[PDB]
Design a binder for this molecule. Structure first.
Ligand SMILES: [K+]
Ligand SMILES: [K+]
Ligand SMILES: [K+]
Ligand SMILES: [K+]
Ligand SMILES: [K+]
Ligand SMILES: [K+]
Ligand SMILES: [K+]
Ligand SMILES: [K+]
Ligand SMILES: [K+]
Ligand SMILES: [K+]
Ligand SMILES: [Mg+2]
Ligand SMILES: [Mg+2]
Ligand SMILES: [Mg+2]
Ligand SMILES: [Mg+2]
Ligand SMILES: [Mg+2]
Ligand SMILES: [Mg+2]
Ligand SMILES: [Mg+2]
Ligand SMILES: [Mg+2]
Ligand SMILES: [Mg+2]
Ligand SMILES: [Mg+2]
Ligand SMILES: [Mg+2]
Ligand SMILES: [Mg+2]
Ligand SMILES: [Mg+2]
Ligand SMILES: [Mg+2]
Ligand SMILES: [Mg+2]
Lengths: 230, 145, 186, 259
RNA sequence: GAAACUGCGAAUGGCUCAUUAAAUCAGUUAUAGUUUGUUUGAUGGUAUCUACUACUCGGAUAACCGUAGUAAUUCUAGAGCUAAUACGUGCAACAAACCCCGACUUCUGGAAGGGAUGCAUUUAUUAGAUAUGCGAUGAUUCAUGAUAACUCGACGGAUCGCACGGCCGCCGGCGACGCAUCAUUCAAAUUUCUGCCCUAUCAACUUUCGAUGGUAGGAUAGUGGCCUACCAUGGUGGUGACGGGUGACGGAGAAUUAGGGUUCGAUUCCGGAGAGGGAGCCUGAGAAACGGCUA
């Protein structure tokens, strides 16, 4: 069958195709979460360990973790879970769909593998280069952790380090940097101060109203007692 | 005396095993028997005030309030336990012939143990919340006739 | 599902009613809790009409029980169910329902009695004076004394475990205690 | 229906709005607010049908979204906001102040008021009860809740509310000899002095009112609004002073004006 | 500013009259027998207590990009990032008062210290009078207060836009959105009385397996044989029950008009029901929804 090999360390992916039952025998009878040595899968895959992620069968149906069968079953699935994206469907809407079991079998058309251990020899399509992350941290805490900044270091100047420059199709010079989130500013401090001040004002108003009502009741009671005394 | 059921019958909210005594306490306070006036000019029977029966559906000593329609009728049947059938007799107008025809309505009504009723006496009943499948009225007054 | 409607019922005259509409969500019913006594406490959350919340107790171990005569509320353990007026099989199954008669641990109440009245059923001068003052009106039910002797107290569950998720109640006293003791002595 | 209705048919709209039969298939459904749907006058009706400032629904929305109309000294941007009895509608740009009052025919009228008369209003107390922490409070029939009210104030009384400070400045007890205005029924919009009150246990209370011309009419307690102490209303009444004129004398007056 | 996450709406509207004969429905009642997103008016005081970010906590995921499967679907699996008013946590500005225990003590006392103490839930005790204080109803052990405890509480703001100021970093305005309680509004649910065509070639019907009522429970938002266990034999009927027919949705109304009457009412307004026939259900304040799902 076909295989989709992914190296997260280098952020790379490749497609491979095998037609040899002797090599596929190692993959056969395994499950989604198990690991397999790549020595059987060709001779360039020596010292490599692959971890299965799933796959699709000859009819395109995906494999679902937890279904301990080699065949295809029908399950009522929630939106957002694997095997049921449910785009454009109502909240709380469930759908019954066909999914294949987690056990590898010859019925599979494509498998998914992730490299967990690197072998002696690198592959020309996977491990030579590493596709740089496009977007850097956006949270202030994330930036501080990335740059090992202290509580006094100014994170603001460190965004320009990974801000990216480019040229537009027109030939214009452009640059883009992320908008820092969860960044303490005088506006946030003022908002907190205003919240506390509103709480204080509410408490003071309640106390004043209670005192005024008590004074009115006391005056009325005094007038009533004076009337009663006569 | 009235503990004829599998469970102990008592008035809710009336504490009995109190170290103090209910001498100057109001009804329902200090362990004294609880009773109330239903209003609308109706008088609380002496039997309800000084009785020992437990009836959560009693208008004067229970947890049911009288509101809505107050009707009058004749006791048609008194064979049920704490429930009677009240037959209301009225005339229905036949417009085309400008005459009347006799008609009747059977209204099940709960009767408290404080009332003594018989088949044929006059009864005044007041509306309350649903008490059973068909009972929505409580016997407020009885004229023995 | 379970329905509380009257459509399926017969008329008061005994005649049959013909259906004219389907079941409505606003007249639904739900399955009973069937709460039991077990060390593995389990309470489920139910979303009910209007977004409100209900608590279904599948298993309960402790309950808030009140001694009315002394006006003392303590959290104790529920030992077992002894009497149930509605159904006898509930006593065998140890079902926890409102008004069921249970036995509760007497340790917290014994401790409170010892600390308050200074009696078992260092100290400073003011403390002994307070205890002596309290001793004047110390009157205790002999039946409650015998119950304390065994370490278990008869109580009535006054809450609804299937609705609030708690088996709270009050210790039997006086005529109610005598009635239930008579019914249990068989 | 499976829930709340969001549409109001034009024929089902209340008659006192005076909407055209063929104007359309719908009428502005009043939004939730201080006043009931059947006893309110939407700002859309006020601005378009009555004052004719806006020629269409869109013009009404455009005018309101500029924050130019204030109800009870508060800016309201909701077209279907329910403005009812005794409410004050102020347009500072036009220097215009109106009070919503029932006319002799039982229809809402925008009675022009002075700047000094536009700073307060009158409310009818529903009941007085204790809230949380034992704090006394009362609620009016226009959805207002006031804490720490005067102990003398009780249900069915009237309270003069200063809007700028949002405070009670005076109150009128519901009693015989007070000038009142009918806010419901066929006698809605009539003004007179209470003559007597008939109380029936477990039933509605009846109030008898004598018009300034001696005409007598009876109504329910919930349809009576007290306007002042004695015989002088605390606010200026619309044209006619709540005097209902028979059709015969109305026609006589119309002919006299014609000639 | 596309796209995408988040929030809201899609329970309104429109269509139709199949089912349905005290049933829907009309007038007239009740909720002191309940729920109610939202709008309008008011109300939010104890969390860490010995860890110890509050000058601000943590882990992901979309869009994006790149490896694809299938004949195929807003069918679908891996891999690489990155946000929150998404998710999960967490100091929650600081008090007073009340109650309990309470060393110590010049001891009928007061006293250090400790516990409890926001709002919400649950169960008990207690007050809530009125022929020198104490609210409301025709009517409530009602509103509400106090005490003892209880709950492994989705509560008690880690949010956003404008402006730009006074003291000596501290304070500071106008709003937006969001959580909790009461009241109000928009409503629903159930409910009191009376009222419906032809038919006796329909006279007895209902009650094992709920029929009528009682006791105790379960369920419900709540009352109720709505359901469960026990108990009693009740409940309706020539004043026509029960059964059957309707080419029967009910009403506002339509046709004809001495008067009385006769006939019609599927259809634009009000109320009900249905989405080919049943049944079940998620989401949600609100659906037994069908231009939602499951058999
Ligand atoms: K931000
Ligand atoms: K969306
Ligand atoms: K919605
Ligand atoms: K009706
Ligand atoms: K009082
Ligand atoms: K009818
Ligand atoms: K119920
Ligand atoms: K029963
Ligand atoms: K119908
Ligand atoms: K919603
Ligand atoms: Mg509709
Ligand atoms: Mg037809
Ligand atoms: Mg009826
Ligand atoms: Mg509301
Ligand atoms: Mg109370
Ligand atoms: Mg019950
Ligand atoms: Mg039909
Ligand atoms: Mg019709
Ligand atoms: Mg048609
Ligand atoms: Mg219609
Ligand atoms: Mg439907
Ligand atoms: Mg069809
Ligand atoms: Mg179908
Ligand atoms: Mg359906
Ligand atoms: Mg539809």
């Amino acid at each position: 069958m076909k295989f989709n090999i992914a190296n997260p360390t280098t952020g790379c992916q490749k497609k491979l195709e095998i037609d040899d039952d002797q090599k596929l025998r190692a993959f056969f009878d395994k499950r989604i979460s198990q690991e397999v040595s790549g020595d059987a899968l060709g001779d360039e895959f020596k010292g490599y360990v692959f971890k299965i992620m799933g796959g699709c069968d000859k009819q395109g149906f995906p494999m679902k973790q937890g279904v301990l069968t080699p065949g295809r079953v029908r399950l009522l699935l929630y939106r957002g879970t694997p095997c049921f994206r449910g785009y454009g469907r109502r909240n709380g809407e469930r759908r019954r769909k066909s999914v294949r079991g987690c056990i590898v079998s010859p019925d599979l058309s494509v498998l998914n593998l992730v490299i967990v251990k690197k072998g002696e020899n690198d592959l020309p399509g996977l491990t030579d280069t590493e596709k740089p992350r496009m977007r850097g941290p956006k949270r202030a805490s994330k930036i501080r952790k990335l740059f090992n900044l202290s509580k006094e270091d100014d994170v603001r100047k460190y965004v320009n380090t990974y801000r990216r420059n480019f040229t537009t199709k027109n030939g214009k010079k452009a640059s883009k940097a992320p908008k820092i989130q969860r960044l303490v500013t005088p506006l946030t401090l003022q908002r907190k101060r205003a919240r506390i001040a509103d709480k204080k004002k509410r408490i003071a108003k309640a106390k004043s109203e209670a005192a005024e009502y008590q004074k009115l009741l006391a005056s009325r009671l005094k007038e009533q007692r004076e009337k009663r005394s006569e | 005396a009235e503990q004829t059921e599998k469970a102990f019958l008592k008035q809710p909210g009336v504490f009995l095993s109190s170290k103090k005594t209910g001498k100057g306490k109001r009804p329902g306070k200090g362990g004294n028997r609880y009773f109330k006036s239903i209003g609308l000019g109706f008088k609380t029977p002496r039997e309800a005030t000084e009785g020992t029966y437990i009836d959560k559906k009693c208008p004067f000593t229970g947890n049911v309030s009288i509101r809505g329609r107050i009707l009058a009728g004749t006791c048609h049947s008194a064979k049920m336990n704490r429930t009677i059938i009240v037959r209301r007799n009225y005339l229905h107008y036949v417009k085309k012939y400008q005459r009347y025809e006799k008609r009747h309505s059977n209204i099940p009504a709960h009767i408290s143990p404080c009332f003594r009723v018989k088949e044929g006496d006059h009864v005044i009943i007041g509306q309350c919340r649903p008490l059973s499948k068909t009972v929505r009225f409580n016997v407020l007054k009885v004229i023995p006739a | 599902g379970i329905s509380r409607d009257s459509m399926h019922k017969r008329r008061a005259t005994g005649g049959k009613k013909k259906a004219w509409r389907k079941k409505r969500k606003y007249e639904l019913g739900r399955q009973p809790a069937n709460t039991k006594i077990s060390a593995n406490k389990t309470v489920r959350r139910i979303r009910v009409r209007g977004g409100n919340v209900k608590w279904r107790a599948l298993r309960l171990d402790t309950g808030n029980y009140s001694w009315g005569s002394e006006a003392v509320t303590r959290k104790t353990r529920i030992l077992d169910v002894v009497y149930n007026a509605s159904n006898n099989e509930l006593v065998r199954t140890q079902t926890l329902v409102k008004s069921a008669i249970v036995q509760v641990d007497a340790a917290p109440f014994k401790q409170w009695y010892l600390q308050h009245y200074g009696v078992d059923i260092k100290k400073s001068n003011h403390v002994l004076r307070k205890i002596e003052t309290r001793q004047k009106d110390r009157k205790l039910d002999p039946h409650i004394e015998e119950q304390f002797g065994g370490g278990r107290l008869l109580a009535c569950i006054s809450s609804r475990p299937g609705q609030c998720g708690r088996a709270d109640g009050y210790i039997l006293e006086g005529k109610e205690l005598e009635f239930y003791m008579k019914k249990l002595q068989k | 229906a499976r829930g709340l209705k969001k549409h109001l048919k034009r024929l089902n709209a209340p008659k006192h709005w005076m909407l055209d039969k063929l104007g359309g298939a719908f009428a502005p459904k009043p939004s939730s607010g201080p006043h009931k749907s059947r006893e309110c006058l939407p700002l859309i009706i006020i601005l378009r049908n009555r004052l004719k400032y806006a020629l269409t629904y869109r013009e009404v929305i455009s005018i309101l979204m500029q924050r130019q109309v204030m109800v009870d000294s508060k800016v309201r941007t909701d077209k279907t906001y329910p403005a009812g009895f005794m409410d004050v509608v102020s347009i500072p740009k036009t220097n215009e102040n109106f009070r919503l009052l029932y006319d002799t025919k039982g229809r809402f009228r925008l009675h022009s008021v002075r700047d000094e008369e536009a700073k307060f209003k009158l409310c009818k107390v529903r009941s007085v009860q204790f809230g949380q922490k034992g704090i006394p409070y009362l609620n009016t029939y226009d959805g207002r809740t006031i804490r720490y009210p005067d102990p003398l104030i009780k249900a069915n009384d009237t309270i003069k509310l200063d809007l700028e400070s949002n405070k009670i400045v005076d109150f009128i007890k519901f009693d015989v000899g007070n000038v009142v205005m009918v806010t419901g029924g066929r006698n809605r919009g009539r003004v007179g002095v209470i003559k007597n009150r008939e109380k029936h246990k477990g039933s509605f209370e009846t109030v008898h009112i004598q018009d300034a011309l001696g005409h007598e009419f009876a109504t329910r307690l919930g349809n009576v609004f007290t306007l002042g102490k004695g015989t002088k209303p605390w606010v200026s009444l619309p044209k006619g002073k709540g005097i209902k004129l028979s059709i015969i004398e109305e026609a006589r007056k119309r002919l006299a004006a014609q000639s």
